[PDB]
Amino acid sequence: HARSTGSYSLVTQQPLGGKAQFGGQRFGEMEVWALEAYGAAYTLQEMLTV
């Protein structure tokens, strides 16, 4: 599954994932810590806002 500009839901400002082609793993705190450990976190700031 993959989704670039797919239809979003109003529940906590995130897509659902089911019933259609919506990709993206649920970005948990472990991958937050993996981005926090190594080089920098501009990728985190640009993927948590826009």
Partner: peptide
């Protein structure tokens, strides 16, 4: 648990599995 309003796991666009 782990996902209640404290910046839970958001489904990030331009991504896939």
């Amino acid at each position: 648990g782990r996902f209640r309003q404290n910046l839970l796991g958001k489904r990030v666009d331009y991504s896939g599995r």
